[PDB]
Amino acid sequence: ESSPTKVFGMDPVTRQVVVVDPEAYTYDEEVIKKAEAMGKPGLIEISPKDDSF
Amino acid sequence: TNRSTVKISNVPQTIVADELLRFLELHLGEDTVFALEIPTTRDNWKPRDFARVQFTTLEVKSRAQLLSSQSKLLFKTHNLRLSEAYDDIIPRPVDPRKRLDDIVLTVGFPESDEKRFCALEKWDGVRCWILTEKRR
Amino acid sequence: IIMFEDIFVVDKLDPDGKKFDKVTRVEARSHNLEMFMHLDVNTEVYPLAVGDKFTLAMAPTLNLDGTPDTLADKYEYIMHGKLYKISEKAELYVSFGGLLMLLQGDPAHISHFELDQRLFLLMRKL
């Protein structure tokens, strides 16, 4: 729920999060801030790709 | 290893006692923390940078020390450092067997030469704690 | 070519924060030489945790047998700076582009360091 847009999804069969539609991240550091607040600093690492547009 | 009270070196200033207690109970066992106290420079609104936590059992204290030595305690981007404390928050024995509850207490003196004891006043449901370290 | 080489173990971190996004000054005590060191290391880029062991080297140049001003492959945290204060148990004050280093040891251990000279900082965490 922390992600402003639908970038991550919850898989009911595997009971784990998955990456769905990675092109709609909009580079808002909301999931990273939430992970840091929860106590997991390196849970999710997102970096832009310099050679892809 | 003498006492179960442990002093935390650095804690965030924005936290409260409840948050630290929840963090400790999440990382350690459930309700394994007895006393948590954060000193305040002012009356009730300016806590200090450190805190003292008293554990119920020495095994919990040893586990917490081991976790702190491995830097596995991260509470709000702060690495808690655990060290020994000068005095306990509450003078309470670690061993549950020593703690005696609801026992009859009476006083008197050897009134007769034979094995006869006289009771002056009897108190019921008293609490008896045996502190080996304090010798009292 | 390496002037000072030793194994160090970090004692404590002044910020002691995982996600402080700030330079963290590390305190390490030497083994077999009893030397205390202050160093500003970017923890986010180069992670260092209390209790870790790392080797530290200082060389005037990174070239082999001269050419002052190829040890890059061996180490992983190369830095460049200058020594500006040698005043003392003598101690050294080297700044790596504003990142201060305080190496406090013995007068005999550190004696071949000149004033206002360029020196490197090689560090590998084993």
Swiss-Prot record, chain A:
It is found in: Nucleus. Coiled coil: none annotated. Belongs to the archaeal Rpo3/eukaryotic RPB3 RNA polymerase subunit family. DNA-dependent RNA polymerase catalyzes the transcription of DNA into RNA using the four ribonucleoside triphosphates as substrates. Component of RNA polymerase II which synthesizes mRNA precursors and many functional non-coding RNAs. Pol II is the central component of the basal RNA polymerase II transcription machinery. It is composed of mobile elements that move relative to each other. NRPB3 is part of the core element with the central large cleft and the clamp element that moves to open and close the cleft. Component of the RNA polymerase II complex consisting of at least 12 subunits. Interacts with SHH1, CLSY1, NRPB11 and NRPD1. Interacts with IYO. This is DNA-directed RNA polymerases II, IV and V subunit 3. The chain holds residues 214 to 266 of 319 of the full protein.
Swiss-Prot record, chain B:
It comes from the Eukaryota. Disruption phenotype: Late flowering and absence of siRNAs derived from FWA tandem repeat regions. Loss of de novo methylation. Increased expression of retrotransposon-derived solo long terminal repeat (solo LTR) and SDC due to their derepression; levels are even higher in the double mutant rdr2-1 jmj24-1. It is found in: Nucleus, Nucleoplasm; Nucleus, Nucleolus; Nucleus. Belongs to the RdRP family. RDR2 is non-functional in the absence of associated Pol IV. RNA-dependent direct polymerase involved in the production of small interfering RNAs (siRNAs). Binds to single-stranded RNA (ssRNA); engages ssRNAs longer than 7 nucleotides and initiates internal to their 3' ends. Able to transcribe the RNA of an RNA/DNA hybrid, the transcript produced by Pol IV, if its 3' end is accessible, to generate double-stranded small interfering RNAs (dsRNAs) precursor essential for establishing and maintaining DNA methylation. Interacts with NRPD1 and SHH1. Associates with Pol IV complex, forming an interpolymerase channel bridging their active sites, through which the Pol IV-generated transcript is handed over to the RDR2 active site after being backtracked, where it is used as the template for double-stranded RNA (dsRNA) synthesis. Interacts with JMJ24. This is RNA-dependent RNA polymerase 2. It comes from Arabidopsis thaliana.
From Swiss-Prot, chain C:
SUPFAM superfamilies: Nucleic acid-binding proteins (SSF50249). It is found in: Nucleus. GO terms for biological process: DNA-templated transcription. Keywords: Nucleus. GO terms for molecular function: DNA-directed RNA polymerase activity. Disulfide bonds: none annotated. The keyword Amino-acid biosynthesis does not apply. One of its GO terms (cellular component) is RNA polymerase IV complex. InterPro entries: NA-bd_OB-fold (IPR012340), RPABC3 (IPR005570). Its main location: nucleus. The keyword Zinc-finger does not apply. Gene3D superfamilies: Nucleic acid-binding proteins. Belongs to the eukaryotic RPB8 RNA polymerase subunit family. Component of the RNA polymerase II, IV and V complexes. Associates with the mediator complex. DNA-dependent RNA polymerase catalyzes the transcription of DNA into RNA using the four ribonucleoside triphosphates as substrates. Component of RNA polymerase II which synthesizes mRNA precursors and many functional non-coding RNAs. Pol II is the central component of the basal RNA polymerase II transcription machinery. It is composed of mobile elements that move relative to each other. This is DNA-directed RNA polymerases II, IV and V subunit 8B. It comes from Arabidopsis thaliana.
